[PDB]
Amino acid sequence: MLPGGPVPVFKKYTVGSKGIWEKLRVLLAIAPNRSTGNPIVPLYRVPTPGSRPEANVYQDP
């Protein structure tokens, strides 16, 4: 590759398919590399900004 692409789907933090539907999607895709840009809910903006632990230890740099 080059230093700037392409990159697989499973290295992209987006919600995809599972099972027979992934086997179909990689069959019917112009680029199976491409992602459905729905963020992974367990990982994106979780913990919320108003519940971060780093606030209690934050000091002025």
Binding site: R45, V46, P47, T48, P49, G50, S51
Partner: protein, 69 residues
């Protein structure tokens, strides 16, 4: 959406991970007054009527009369 109590308006909105149901006792605000939740009352008789909290800066003379003795 004005009918959604504060705290939940933030939880609903992904601001805090913990609801005000499950928040600790120490994170809750201390109130010396009774909490009254009132939603938006626009379009109703309960709409806010603004006014001046002050009185006129220049006070006038209340006329009192004296006789020429």
């Amino acid at each position: 959406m004005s009918q959604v109590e504060p705290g939940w308006h933030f939880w609903l909105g992904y601001g805090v991970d913990t609801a005000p149901c499950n928040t600790p006792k120490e994170k809750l605000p201390i109130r010396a007054y009774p909490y009254k939740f009132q939603p938006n009352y626009t379009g109703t008789p309960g709409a806010f009527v603004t006014y001046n909290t002050l009185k006129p800066k220049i006070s006038a003379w209340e006329p009192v009369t004296k006789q020429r003795s």
